[PDB]
Amino acid sequence: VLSEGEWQLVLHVWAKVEADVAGHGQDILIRLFKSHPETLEKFDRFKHLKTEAEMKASEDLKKHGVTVLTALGAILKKKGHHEAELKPLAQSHATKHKIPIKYLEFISEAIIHVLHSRHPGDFGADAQGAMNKALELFRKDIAAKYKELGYQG
Template identity: 75%
Template sequence: ICLSNSETPGVAGPWLCSRWQLSGLTSPPASVCRLFHDHPETLDRFERFKGLTTPDQMKASEDLKKHGVTVLTQLGKILKLKGKHEAELKPLAQTHATKHKIPVKYLEFISEVIIKVIAEKHSADFGADSQAAMKKALELFRNDMASKYKEFGFQG
C-alpha cells in the first residue's frame, strides 16, 4: 500500500503549513502537549517529562519544545519521502525499539493527535480527503515502524 498521486498533496500541503510553525516556537508543539494530555500513560516512556502534569507546565517546558520539534521534523522528513524512507526509518525504529521502547500503540496515539491538531489549526486546507490521506500516510509509517521493530526483536 502506498499513497496515490492524488493523495500526496493532501499530506504535503497541510504538513508544510504545520511544519513552518516549528521555527520560532515559544512553547512545545500542540500535538505533543495534546498527546501527553490525552494519553498520560505515554509520559511513562519519558523520564524527563514525568513531572509535567498540567498544560501550563507542558507549555513552559523547553525540553518538551525541543523534543516536539525533533519528533515532528523527523516525521516530516519521512512523510516527504513518500514511502521511500528506509534510510531514515531504520535508525529511528532502532532507537524507538531498543532504547526508548515506544509501543506501536503510542505511534498510533501521536498519529491521531497530529490529524486532530492539523484539522483544528488548518480546517480550510485539511478537509476529509486530506485527513484520509494523512491518516493513510501515518498508518504506512506505523506499519513500517512495526516491521522494523520486529527486526530489532521488539514486539512493541
C-alpha cells in the same frame, strides 16, 4: 501505497505546519500526554510535568516537539521511500526508548487532531484520510522493523 494525489494532500497541509513547527510540536505532545498519560511516563525528560500549563511553559518540551516534527516531515517528504529514515528511528524507539507501536498510533491521532484544528481549510476529509494513510504507512514500516528486532509484541 498512497497515490500521488494523496501525497499532495499530505504535503500540502504539512507545508502549513512548517510555518510554526514548534507550536505544532507543543500542541501534539501535550495532546498525546493528556489523552494517553502512559506516554508521558516514557519520557524521563518530561515526566515531572503534571499540568497542561507546566507543559506549555517547558522550553525543553517545545524543543523536543521540533525534533519530532522535523523527523516526521523528512519522512513524509520521501513519499514512502523512507527506509533510511526509519531504520534509526525504529531502532531507538524499539530498543532504547521502549515505545510500543500502539503509542505511535496515539501520536498519529494527536498529529491529525492538531492539523485539523490549525489548518481546517487544508485539512478537510480528503486530506485527513490521506494523512491517516501516510501515518499508517509510517506505523506499518516501523512495525516491520520492530518485529525483526523482537519488539512487535
